[PDB]
Design a protein around this ligand. Sequence first.
Ligand code: CL
Ligand code: CL
Ligand code: CL
Ligand code: CL
Ligand code: CL
Ligand code: CL
Ligand code: CL
Ligand code: CL
Ligand code: CL
Ligand code: CL
Ligand code: CL
Ligand code: CL
Ligand code: NA
Ligand code: ZN
Ligand code: ZN
Ligand code: ZN
Ligand code: ZN
Ligand code: ZN
Ligand code: ZN
Ligand code: ZN
Ligand code: ZN
Ligand code: ZN
Ligand code: ZN
Ligand code: ZN
Ligand code: ZN
Ligand code: ZN
Ligand code: ZN
Ligand code: ZN
Ligand code: ZN
Ligand code: ZN
Lengths: 269, 271, 270, 270, 269
Amino acid sequence: KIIFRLLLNVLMSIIAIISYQWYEQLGIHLTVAPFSLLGIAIAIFLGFRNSASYSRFVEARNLWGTVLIAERTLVRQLRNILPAEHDAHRRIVSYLVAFSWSLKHQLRKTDPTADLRRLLAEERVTEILASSMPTNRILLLAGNEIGQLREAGKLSDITYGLMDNKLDELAHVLGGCERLATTPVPFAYTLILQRTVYLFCTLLPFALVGDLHYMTPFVSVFISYTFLSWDSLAEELEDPFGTAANDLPLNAMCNTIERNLLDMTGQHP
Amino acid sequence: IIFRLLLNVLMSIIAIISYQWYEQLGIHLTVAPFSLLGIAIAIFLGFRNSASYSRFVEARNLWGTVLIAERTLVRQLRNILPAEHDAHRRIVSYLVAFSWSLKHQLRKTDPTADLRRLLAEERVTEILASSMPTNRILLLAGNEIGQLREAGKLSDITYGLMDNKLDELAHVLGGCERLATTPVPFAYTLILQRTVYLFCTLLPFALVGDLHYMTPFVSVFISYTFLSWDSLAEELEDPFGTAANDLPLNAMCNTIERNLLDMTGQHPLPE
Amino acid sequence: LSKIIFRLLLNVLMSIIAIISYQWYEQLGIHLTVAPFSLLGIAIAIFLGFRNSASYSRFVEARNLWGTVLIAERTLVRQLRNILPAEHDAHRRIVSYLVAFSWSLKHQLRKTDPTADLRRLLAEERVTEILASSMPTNRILLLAGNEIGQLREAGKLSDITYGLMDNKLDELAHVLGGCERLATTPVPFAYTLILQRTVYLFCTLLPFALVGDLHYMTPFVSVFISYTFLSWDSLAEELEDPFGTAANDLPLNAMCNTIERNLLDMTGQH
Amino acid sequence: SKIIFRLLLNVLMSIIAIISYQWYEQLGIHLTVAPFSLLGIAIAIFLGFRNSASYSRFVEARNLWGTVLIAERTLVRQLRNILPAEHDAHRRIVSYLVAFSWSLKHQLRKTDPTADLRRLLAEERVTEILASSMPTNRILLLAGNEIGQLREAGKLSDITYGLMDNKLDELAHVLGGCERLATTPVPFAYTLILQRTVYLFCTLLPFALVGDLHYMTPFVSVFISYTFLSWDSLAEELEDPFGTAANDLPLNAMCNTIERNLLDMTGQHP
Amino acid sequence: LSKIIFRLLLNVLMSIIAIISYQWYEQLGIHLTVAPFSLLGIAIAIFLGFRNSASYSRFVEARNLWGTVLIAERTLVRQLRNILPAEHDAHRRIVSYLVAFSWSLKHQLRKTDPTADLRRLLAEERVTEILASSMPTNRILLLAGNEIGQLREAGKLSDITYGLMDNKLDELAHVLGGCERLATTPVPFAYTLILQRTVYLFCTLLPFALVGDLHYMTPFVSVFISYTFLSWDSLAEELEDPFGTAANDLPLNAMCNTIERNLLDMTGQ
Ligand SMILES: [Cl-]
Ligand SMILES: [Cl-]
Ligand SMILES: [Cl-]
Ligand SMILES: [Cl-]
Ligand SMILES: [Cl-]
Ligand SMILES: [Cl-]
Ligand SMILES: [Cl-]
Ligand SMILES: [Cl-]
Ligand SMILES: [Cl-]
Ligand SMILES: [Cl-]
Ligand SMILES: [Cl-]
Ligand SMILES: [Cl-]
Ligand code: NA
Ligand SMILES: [Zn+2]
Ligand SMILES: [Zn+2]
Ligand SMILES: [Zn+2]
Ligand SMILES: [Zn+2]
Ligand SMILES: [Zn+2]
Ligand SMILES: [Zn+2]
Ligand SMILES: [Zn+2]
Ligand SMILES: [Zn+2]
Ligand SMILES: [Zn+2]
Ligand SMILES: [Zn+2]
Ligand SMILES: [Zn+2]
Ligand SMILES: [Zn+2]
Ligand SMILES: [Zn+2]
Ligand SMILES: [Zn+2]
Ligand SMILES: [Zn+2]
Ligand SMILES: [Zn+2]
Ligand SMILES: [Zn+2]
């Protein structure tokens, strides 16, 4: 994709060289100086934009970081507060593991059913799949587990509350991820910046050819590489739950989560 | 926007057909000064759009919190008082009323339909009497939580747990109000817009000396880049203004309503 | 201050002396190209951008702090209604302190006299207590804390519900510090010092380095460049005094009225 | 200004440039503006970022100090509100909190805490504090014992103990925040190399400037040198916000304010 | 031999090559002006500026994370004394776990062996149990959690006071999560890929563009412009791996020492 636009730029430079003979005749002059202005303007704009994209990526990485943290500490509190309640341990862990996988699926816009069935009773799978938000439902069921221990008097209102906070933290992760997935910043205004860099890159050799002659392709490819490299990297970072090269290894992240939670509950991968 | 590009092409054609008369009289326009001007304008547009983007992001975050806090509040009600479905349905009404009412507040549109749909007509009059209707809804949601505590169904601890979620909604209300009765750059936003507008119309006259017939092509391309970047900032600066795209706000209020009905088993339709 | 129209007009005068003294240039041997003024102009524009950023942030923080007053006081009034709906005497006392706090904080930041307002809202005993302090607004918080505190001794609030309302006072305490910190810590003077020199000197020497290129079109270009750098410099001017009384500053009286109106709407037996 | 030295030194180099411009072709030395435009702008961009990074450190340092005032204020309020009678505890706790500020200032300035410590506390304590290589942390632990004892005594519940405990946490965070900004500087490549670069650019600039400016060069080069060197030295100043320079923090004024605040009116309250 | 001085000396040679070969330009048909190399270099600087910005923030984040370790450990030991002044048995056990956590984290981020430092601090029954887990640092927190848990079950801590100390474990959990997130997820390798190529190629081709305008002045001006760009680029590289072993990286050994000495001073050791 990047190499296609680079090859088309080498070609366009040749078009500029072979048709430079016609330049004076057809009545067209093109200096470097105006293209330097527009060039720098674009660079400034790509610089800010690209930084904005990196921010989103870092936030996305961060939210997933919190899934692991919150889940670890929720399991920790369960063990420290109710060390004898290993039934509750196992079931809650099931939901927390389910939550992660379901979040991966949600963000990937794929089917959660395989993973859900692996981890949970089929009655719960139907309840979870029935909801507009399966991750929200999973949190509600994990909520019932601690909520029932509270009714049984095995948790106090304080110790229920400490565990409730972690579910609250997971709610916040889910909200943040949902926010980052459903936020393409006006669909037109990324396509409009892209068509700008593109149109600048292909008109540049035409302007460069006066000053450079046969060097035109070598300089024009180098400039275009730089600008396109930057533009496309910003594109990858913008959508961090995607399946692109420089996007979050969400399946690996989910494995780490499950393994951690299994390690904490005396069980073996 | 497309008017201003057509105005630019018109200004370019003027600059071609008049280049002869004026540059001979002793009035010249080089590219080097308009390059300094344009780069500085770009730098300023760069920083400007940065401030704009951050207002846009804060708006998204605040609205994200509505979703989050309302969800966790309804979770807490279900987990702490599994039996109290009448309380569940009342609190869910206000929470959904809160979202629509806040949207209507920011967009400066009429909430009446949404309130009449969600709430008892006594409550709707109380809410519509107030000069701060969104706050009033929050207060009502409060009483429901308060009555449950008074009835001994919530302890001070568990009342407290739900109370935090109402604070979170309060923070969202305020943050939004501050992002609405705005901006913080107090109508300089019209000066930079004109600074761009004038720079784009004087530019063909600076460029024609170097480009002759190519001028309308190169001048419109530059103008496009600057005017687009300026337009984007203006759009982002004002996430709740009467001209903004209302899709995501509506999408948000719909999401939460749907979520909440699901959470209280009002969905799906019974078999 | 609209010195922007003075300096724009001084710039026209600076172009005029440049056009007519342009002959006496090579005689002396003084030449001024655009190129090194592009380098300087760019460098000045970067530093102007980074500075205006700081200026902007400080203004936003001022808004946020004031925004929190409204939030924390709304919620503290709410809490009192839902937790103690019978206790309208306590409601009215706490409310009057909260309103007092807002007004007192405004007067403090504006360096004006809070006495009139305090006396409108509070008992002369309390006014005396507040004004006796070297930190009046902080003392109002202490008094508001005392009402909440009494309710706790009386047993109308548990340690838990006491705690829920204390946090709101902690928030108003962060507003108070915030505002104080802002009022005493400007964007460092050096910035606005350095930049005010370089931006003015630049706008002055510019028509001199443009006339060689522009002959007669020097006023209309040097002005348009100058207006651009000065607009952007004066934007920082109009954003660095958020607590003032100027048109561009925060409408703190209006905000205080908004606060008072809000807390009165929340009370009235309904 | 160490700038006034290097600004005059720039004028001397810019005379050398005016006299040498004939001999350029003799010595074989062509030197256009455009390469130094590229290098200058690159340096401006890097100065902009560096300076922004420094201001951040300034701002964070200021904020952490702000929290000291806030947290200490509310912790006194909490004691005045929850235990209104316990003045001996109030007085003891306040003296530790005041010790905390001065102690921290001395820690960050690397000066002797003993003067200010003796002014405020019992001599047994002044030696317990001085015996620890972490004096500020020690003071905190001491303030911690005071609220702890009030709880062993059953004068505070677990809840009301917690409310105060949180405020000591907040101060621990300031301590850590301040230690991080102090013991961790902005890495020495950032300062050492960037200063070489700005100055080496500043000396060479007139040599490439003559061709265009002829006689005007010493002015237009000093103006450029001012702009660049000002920005770099200001960055260098703000990087170390607990230092003693002009644009650094008034740490002495701040601890005076903290003290005046806690001790307001012989420490008497309504 | 120091990467930076080598790439400078390659650039002084690139300049003499450009001087000696300037004659052949006219004949071979290769015209190279400064104007487009200004556009290129400026763009590269902007992108270098923004990139360096990201690398700095990552370094700063790592610093804050370690700052929190010290803060949270200090206040947890402080709480232990103020709430349970008699229970020095528990003080010593918890302090040893808290010091273990610091060292374990250090070793984890350094990909080095925690055994020596852990054996120095803890009983053998514990050290093997901890090292048996694939998440040893997380395991140490679960064990510190247990101490707090036992003290609660023994009635020595109330639910409230248990809560107060539990939040301090939560804080350490976040540090661990944050640190792991920084160690495993780098600043996207595309940033180094793109910018290392583009800077190097730009510095190399530059004298060939400068030579027409600068002649024998070329080497001096070219090495200077190279130095400015290469220094900035390598500074970003040194800031990007803050858990490394360089002198420019975080003195993690010093910090862990400060932590240990700190918590021993607090208990009377
Ligand atoms: Cl956590
Ligand atoms: Cl387990
Ligand atoms: Cl929440
Ligand atoms: Cl229901
Ligand atoms: Cl609140
Ligand atoms: Cl239900
Ligand atoms: Cl009332
Ligand atoms: Cl506080
Ligand atoms: Cl009322
Ligand atoms: Cl802490
Ligand atoms: Cl001990
Ligand atoms: Cl001890
Ligand atoms: Na906790
Ligand atoms: Zn022609
Ligand atoms: Zn957490
Ligand atoms: Zn178990
Ligand atoms: Zn929340
Ligand atoms: Zn229900
Ligand atoms: Zn022409
Ligand atoms: Zn549904
Ligand atoms: Zn709040
Ligand atoms: Zn009332
Ligand atoms: Zn003002
Ligand atoms: Zn606080
Ligand atoms: Zn007292
Ligand atoms: Zn000369
Ligand atoms: Zn903490
Ligand atoms: Zn001990
Ligand atoms: Zn023993
Ligand atoms: Zn080993």
